[PDB]
Design a protein around this ligand. Structure first.
Ligand code: GIP
Ligand code: GIP
Ligand code: ZN
Ligand code: ZN
Lengths: 176, 176
């Protein structure tokens, strides 16, 4: 079986005071073609590009996306970086230059061997209307809301095949 | 080369009004042994276990961790699930029952072929003092702050080998 509630709680320690201002800032995914990824995360999911970083010597670019208002992005370069990297829950897309033209390359989504990472998840007001719009836009589904084992939640895929869960927090209580 | 700023902006669309309340709620990682993972995320990183879910029929448990105050967790079951799954920036650890006793099993961190997912990142007030405490606790480092190419940021590993970046948002402006 799994851990009992009691055993799980027994493995948890209270937070040391030196970790009090820590925050979960980002999740990083590698993307083959940033033009496709930027269109997907902004047009389909409504995220905002808050910061683009280029490192010519190492041949890669980074794209930070988040659910933030465009009007809150600072104009000054140094303030912009400090603000972008101190937002909670950002998505960092890494583009290693050249992958978009290489037919033998692709990234692995973690859901087939060898497994590891599973998904990112977006909380929405209504899974059914959000998925109706996704179907209208031609988005590829891993799991429609009424398919699979757990009903009421969905999995879509981004341009690289990463899985994105679509969930409504106020309808999850009957799954357990 | 990579995308110019102008070309990147050209691939972004304004957010459709039906995505206005969407939020980036979780990142899911599979963990071999939840006892080790819970101790690492709570004792080393100071996160709080906000919700534990067990699915006996499918043989797995889910552990949601976040930088949230323990006193804000609702007491009622249904309110607790709605609150936990509407927090931004949570970490979902999936335990498939039995992996902790299987010597031939382990998860892949995404940083060696086949690559995909890279890391989660934690923003802290001071990278050097946080890493000093991590060293005192026996945490395994992928990259100490002054090693590697980008100075001032670190990468530590959790019990499964997943990479966790330690960064100070106010010291990143000179890297570009
Ligand atoms: N054996 C699986 C175990 C994990 C698992 O099965 N996760 C669920 C989504 S719950 C999840 O990811 N999530 O965020 C969540 C957490 C708590 C609740 I309550 C509801 C949803 C899944 O993929 N279901 C497919 C289906 O139902 O057909 C694995 O390794 O991925
Ligand atoms: N070829 C690489 C490209 C991505 C990459 O190299 N990322 C950096 C951390 S920046 C990153 O992950 N992050 O959040 C970040 C973003 C913007 C800034 I400004 C600073 C840090 C890395 O791993 N450096 C190792 C080293 O320096 O030795 C890859 O595929 O992983
Ligand atoms: Zn990063
Ligand atoms: Zn999930």
């Amino acid at each position: 079986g799994g851990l009992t509630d009691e055993a799980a709680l027994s493995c948890c320690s209270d937070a040391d005071p030196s970790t009090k201002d820590f925050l979960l800032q980002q999740t990083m995914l590698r993307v083959k073609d940033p033009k496709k990824s930027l269109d997907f995360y902004t047009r389909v999911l409504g995220m905002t590009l808050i910061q683009k970083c280029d490192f010519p010597i190492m041949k890669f670019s980074l794209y930070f996306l988040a659910y933030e208002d465009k009007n809150d992005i600072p104009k000054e370069k140094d303030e912009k970086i400090a603000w972008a990297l101190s937002r909670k829950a950002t998505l960092e897309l890494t583009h290693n230059w050249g992958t978009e033209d290489d037919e033998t390359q692709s990234y692995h989504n973690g859901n087939s061997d060898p497994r590891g990472f599973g998904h990112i998840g977006i909380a929405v007001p209504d899974v059914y209307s959000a998925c109706k719009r996704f179907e209208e836009l031609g988005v590829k589904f891993v799991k429609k809301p009424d398919d699979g084992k757990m009903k009421g939640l969905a999995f879509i895929q981004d341009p690289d095949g990463y899985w994105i869960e679509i969930l409504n927090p106020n309808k999850m209580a009957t799954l357990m």
